[model samples]
Target: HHWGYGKHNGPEHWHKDFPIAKGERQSPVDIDTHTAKYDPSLKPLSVSYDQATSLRILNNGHAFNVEFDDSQDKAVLKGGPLDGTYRLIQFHFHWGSLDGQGSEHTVDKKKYAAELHLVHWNTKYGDFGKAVQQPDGLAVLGIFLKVGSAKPGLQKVVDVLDSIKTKGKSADFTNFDPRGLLPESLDYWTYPGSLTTPPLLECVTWIVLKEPISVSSEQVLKFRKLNFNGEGEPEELMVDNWRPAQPLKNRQIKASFK
Candidate 1:
């Protein structure tokens, strides 16, 4: 039945072949900043970095994900806000056109330069993905990356973008600490939602930080350098890999310290 499935417009042509495909949830939204009420008590928990912190790097060339071992972080979400031991999981990014304009979670209909998703899971639940099935089981730390002063020490990751320039190619990258990428402040807004991707699982506890991290234009180009090309092969130009924004669906977004 999937005979003529191409990239663009292909899904549209044969979506009728699969009825469930219509329910898929896309990501990257222009969050209503004017409607957002800020509260100030929500602060990031102390996370320690050690020798055996269990770091993992997935080189899904189109996109990369870096994971950290959160067992040492004393950040536990009790009642009032959330209802679980929220453990840090992984972090990833989203991008737009050459100028880096369209980003998820907009402020007053204004999109930031780019966006980052710091995925966390409920330790009280058996697995991370499964935890996404409960409103209180998952916490995603979102940060907006704007084009400004170059981020110091980000070379640790940008330097490796060339290693996995091809799709389906991954590598074990160590000696690199993930904490270096965290923004300076942890002031955040929390909300109840679902996965921004397919299956639209309604179990996510979102923690979108109000503060944004700075990345230089050079660093932005580093991300733009990625493609579906591998070692010893001509580089394939990859542009505009960001997912489109999704609908809010009557969900209430709560913030701390307005």
Candidate 2:
């Protein structure tokens, strides 16, 4: 009851406990490509994922997160506005009840059907919990999900949703390489922003890919079928979990491509 997507305890009330929710550098900002400055200094992103590192998928009542084994450097993201290597911790998605507008971030005021977030923690900060407290402690790769052809890679993720449809349910999901879900181009827009969720930590260096990957309408609808309530609770569809775009403030958005 502290913070949720409900009318009584939604994002608007998060500032009560987390004053940073109203901070200058909040996340899920609208990315205006025309105004974004192209920076040649931005390095090509390096993402290496070991399929074995993927452990299990779970429904945390808010969103379904696929947790990974971050004990070692098996999967890491480097370069592209990053000062050092970041270890992959988990990946999750945000979507709406329908396919028109579910993505947290937008492009030139355009929203996609869904969005994917690959959360990573900077190894320079020792651990994820500690990293979340520092300014330059986290790097989250954002991928927009469009409605189109059926994505084989995404289908694998969808296949397990039924197993974790209830809140707190989990299923073993291993040997799945998340790299297959990425778009061909790594060109991205980088800016310093906070997490889109409660606690709204302002520690992430957001790297959002300009190119979006495709998923079928059916695949997207499956995400909406997820339940926000636990067993024996009132049924509630877990849709529209995305937070609206926040103000950009004085932050500069750097583009990796012209």
Candidate 3:
């Protein structure tokens, strides 16, 4: 119910399994950035370059997890807009070990080739364990990677994916520039939403960018090669890592230009 594919397979199927899924706030609702209402206040306080205080790659049976130290102060959102100091915790990706479509954000209900999420929390309110209880205490920056002209700056991350290919495998990564993965623009569409998974907390501040970073077809195929779905395995492969788009719940999505 939390993750799935076509024909009632992904996040959209959560309601069927739990019945409360319909009440959740889903993202990537297909906003035409050119037409949406804008307000400068909606922009992030400031996105500074963050150096990973430390990096660790953990094989979580499904995909490789890259944890980074986001010590940069400005990047954390606390109080006013939300009531806590949001700190960078870990980063991960969703994609097929192949090359069709691996991203979660959908345009007009269409899926992108792949997606990457930099997860953070508000340490000011409490530790990550307790911050999830409060609203507006978490902010997640979502970046969509599309197959196109050339692979942008993701080579560093992709290079390490092989080290943690199986469940329980882990390794250390260091001296990484978290900013390299960022697109040319930090301008984004902001709104209040929940994690695309279960126990759907309505405290997330989502900032999804309008422009997608480019990656080569070869790189994308690497994601497709991941083997989550074995013979008789419940899950197919990494191709269906996306959660279905959630309803707007009457929430207003604000852009940065009003």
Candidate 4:
């Protein structure tokens, strides 16, 4: 009945409900370095977050999201491709059933184990709902995840999954900083894109990091165990919940480094 990543209600079928699925700024495009323009003027991205700002976590049918207390004057993303500051509202991850095919944004057709989205909304619009309708309303920071040794930084999130194994489940997950999930370098590719999910708003400025973080394959398997259904409902594994790359059209993707 709603848009999902399954073959039945997947990205291919999204256009039936959200015509913007065919829009110019659709997200998760293939990042070909040959085509990306190196912009010397691009500044390093900065994050101003209080570790205590993390409010909670939830399994929202699509992905497990960690919500933050952006309602206050705290936790912001700035610089890079942004015109001004944007508040960090929430963060989530997208993954595959296996290691090689999960990430939404591909680099030269190469897919990683997963992708993390740190979502921020422009403060000028007053509210996230209102901001999402504007072209410059959002700035999402994307980080690629590769299979490697265990990443202790991400263990907290994985450990709590058992309690939120079903959709619509949430729990208090405060006191943690998302800095635990980022890669070392901030070098990135910037592009105009939309939200990868329904409503599919073409209001995002995608800043995808060039460097990737390492997480154990076992950590990724835990994500696959999450369900799209609530308790007592038909279970649906939440794996492969990522959208494929869309058309590049006439847009240019800018890189922060050579």
Candidate 2: where is the Cα deviation over 4 Å? none
- Estimate, for each residue in 225-244, the C-alpha lDDT of model 1 and write its tens digit: 77644556776544454545
lDDT of 2 by residue, 31-117 (tens): 998999999999888888754389999999999999999988778999999998999999999998878888999999999989999
Name the candidate, 3 or 4, with the larger TM-score value.
4
- Report lDDT (CA) for all predictions: 0.61, 0.92, 0.64, 0.91
Q: Give the per-residue lDDT of model 3 (tens digit) for 1-258.
A: 234444655565666664646665655456555556777554244554453464687766555667766545534533323344567777677775445566666655556777778777877665666767867667877888878866546777678766655556678887666677778876667778876655556667877776778888877766665545433456444555666566677877777644
TM-score for each model? 0.78, 0.97, 0.81, 0.97
- What is model 2's C-alpha RMSD? 1.0
Candidate numbers sorted by lDDT from highest down: 2, 4, 3, 1
In model 1, the worst 10-residue window by lDDT is 2-11
Deviation (Å) of 114 in candidate 4: 0.4
Q: Per model, state how many residue pairs clash.
A: 9, 0, 20, 0
Q: Please give the lDDT score for candidate 2.
A: 0.92
Question: Candidate 1: which stretches are off by over 4 Å?
Answer: 1-28, 39-54, 69-80, 228-238
Give the clashing residue pairs of candidate 2, or none. Answer: none
Better candidate by TM-score, 1 or 2: 2
lDDT of 4: 0.91
Name model 4 segments beyond 4 Å from true. none
